[PDB]
Amino acid sequence: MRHPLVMGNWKLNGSRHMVHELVSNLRKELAGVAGCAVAIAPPEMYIDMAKREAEGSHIMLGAQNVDLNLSGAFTGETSAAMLKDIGAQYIIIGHSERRTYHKESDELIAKKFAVLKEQGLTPVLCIGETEAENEAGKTEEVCARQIDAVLKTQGAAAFEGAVIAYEPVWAIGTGKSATPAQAQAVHKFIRDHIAKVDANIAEQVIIQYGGSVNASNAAELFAQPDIDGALVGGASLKADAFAVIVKAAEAAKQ
Amino acid sequence: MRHPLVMGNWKLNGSRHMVHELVSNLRKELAGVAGCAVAIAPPEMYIDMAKREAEGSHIMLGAQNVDLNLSGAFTGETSAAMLKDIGAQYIIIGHSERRTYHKESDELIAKKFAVLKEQGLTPVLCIGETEAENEAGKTEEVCARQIDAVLKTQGAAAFEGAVIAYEPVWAIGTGKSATPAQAQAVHKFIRDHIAKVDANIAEQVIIQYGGSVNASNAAELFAQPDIDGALVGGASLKADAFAVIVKAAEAAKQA
Ligand SMILES: [Cl-]
């Protein structure tokens, strides 16, 4: 029985005003929630402020990316040691926006995963297939490759305490939609793939859905046995909507 | 005359403890400075804390990079609107570490310059030639090309109130250093290049030296007429050393 995790990826959205309002409203909307863990990833300059504002709540912090070095002559980079130092626990790596827009390779993302692991932070490893890969029936091949970049170079124990987020990139448009059954099939495949190396590790990995989640499909999605929560995008910017998703995850896994 | 600017590029160095200690020590060491402007660029997650620690001093804040979007579905990016909101003013763009390790193009860097000007922020445009380029006699061609990415798309007016930092990249990990005379010749070339388009704008541009600057060598660099300060790396992590540099710039440019 895995404790669910709902994480808000704020993407490139935030301000001093917005952080104060949204974190305060999240605390209020999440009052009484005990059965679903909650994390947020504001833009990096606001992590400190958000952590301090989250004091008194159960909201955990996180970040949207990390680089490979801990310190040194690396102007503009993000250090895992510094993310740990300001209080970010859940660090998104390999998001589709970075694999695409920033050409981040599977191997680079696996290096990120390793640095996070060495610092004692929790990677949120994003994986998923494109429109063409999905059409060609390559969903499993792609997800296995993206996972193997870590599994084959770092061992199954690399996944102890880790999170994977499955992004059905192929379903981004309003023309295509992933059903809970389709999502479940991919999550089961992911878990089964790790289980071939270590069944115990596979059992404890948190596999979040990273496709669009709303109040009308959350119950069904979270009703699936291998779906352990969600990495939420736009809905994370509105406290009421985000809390509905968190409560649905709590209700489903109780 | 041009009022000098000494800016500390902390690079990938910082922690809450380090920020508090360093900013406190900088406040003390720089409290008596009048004739040199000072900025610091901590790692992005520490800008807010550093800005709050600097309140009450003349230390200005800055950042080490920016991306192109103000907001939206751009996981992991840095927004100029957010840098403005948290209090950063001097934004380093095109640093040699980013042109090399992150393959940032002249054109990308010029787009970053434009977004910063749209937000009322001050670009610190880094330019400079590699070991191979220096060996090939292309110092001027390279600097001209990197500057032209902005000048030929946004005009000389884009350089109002802006800063340029010249990095002799050929001096990094080669065990060599540019002499003050060599640095001065490059700075005068950069200024003359902009002057071909607008002499007035060229006279007011702050052109910082971005090679290695140390408490020991700051005076000899700041004695040069077209060197208006420095973008300091390692010495920026020790308040005593950084203050010696600031004071050297103040003394060199003082009435
Ligand atoms: Cl110090």
Author numbering:
A (entry chain B): 1 to 254
B (entry chain A): 1 to 255
Give sentences copied directly from the paper behind this entry.
AcP is bound in the active site. The acP ligand is surrounded by the Fo-Fc omit map that was contoured at the 3 sigma level. The S. cerevisiae structure has the substrate 1,3-dihydroxyacetone phosphate (13P) bound in its active site. An arrow indicates the movement for loop closure between open (cyan) and closed (gray) forms of the protein. An alternative or additional contribution is from hydrogen bonds between the phosphoryl group and hydrogen bond donors such as hydroxyl and/or amide functional groups that surround the lysine. Like K1065 of the RNAP β subunit, other lysines located in active sites of proteins that bind a phosphorylated substrate could be acetylated by acP.
Taken together, these crystallographic results confirm the hypothesis that acP can acetylate lysine residues in the absence of an acetyltransferase. Finally, we propose that acP-dependent acetylation can be both non-enzymatic and specific, with specificity determined by the local three-dimensional (3D) environment that surrounds the substrate lysine residue, as well as by its solvent accessibility and pKa.
